[PDB]
Amino acid sequence: GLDDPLPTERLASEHLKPGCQGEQCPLVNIDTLKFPDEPQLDPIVERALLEMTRTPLPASLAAYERQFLDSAEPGWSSYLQAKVREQHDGLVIIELSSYLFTGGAHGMPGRGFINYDRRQHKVLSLQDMLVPGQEEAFWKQAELAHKAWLLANKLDQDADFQKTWPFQRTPHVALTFGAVTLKYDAYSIAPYSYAHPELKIPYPRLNGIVKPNLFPGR
Numbered sequence: 001g002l003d004d005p006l007p008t009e010r011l012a013s014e015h016l017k018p019g020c021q022g023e024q025c026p027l028v029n030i031d032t033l034k035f036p037d038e039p040q041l042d043p044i045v046e047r048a049l050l051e052m053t054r055t056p057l058p059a060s061l062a063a064y065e066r067q068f069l070d071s072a073e074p075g076w077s078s079y080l081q082a083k084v085r086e087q088h089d090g091l092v093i094i095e096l097s098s099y100l101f102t103g104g105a106h107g108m109p110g111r112g113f114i115n116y117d118r119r120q121h122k123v124l125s126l127q128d129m130l131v132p133g134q135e136e137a138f139w140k141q142a143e144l145a146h147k148a149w150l151l152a153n154k155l156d157q158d159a160d161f162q163k164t165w166p167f168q169r170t171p172h173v174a175l176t177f178g179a180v181t182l183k184y185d186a187y188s189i190a191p192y193s194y195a196h197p198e199l200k201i202p203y204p205r206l207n208g209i210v211k212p213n214l215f216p217g218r
Contacts, residue, residue, distance in 0.1 A: 026072035
């Protein structure tokens, strides 16, 4: 049923490079999902996780794991994760996480969203969520959500931080129930200490911007 949540099967594994003994043994950790009632989502999730490893992509998560373990140098690791952030009004909001370490100063984190509409059997892009011609108006509301985020973090009067980290767009937009979530990659609008900043645009600020049929059922 559309107003019922989709049941899901969790596929988790941690694999070490074969024959390697020690703390420096290369490791691949994959935590993904399968949807028995919506099987179209299974390859959509797999591809979205493979995109976070990017050059053509491996054909599968098992091909990626095999390739990484075959060429990894000592101490390297790769983490990929897909989890259901929310289910509401026929929408499935999948949150994606990645962590890549290749012997550098530190690791490389990644984040992403999947906004899957079960009514249409479609992944929604920002373009699919908006009233035609309103992208400019959407990022104007995002700018306001940035100002609210600065005030919440006591950065409202810190002009040196604001010049260093001006407002930027993000490809990661989720149709969360409480507000529209804008999730930022590390080091885009803040230092790594702020992790992955989340901007929230209230739905009443998006009247005539976001398609009305995508507003939460309240």
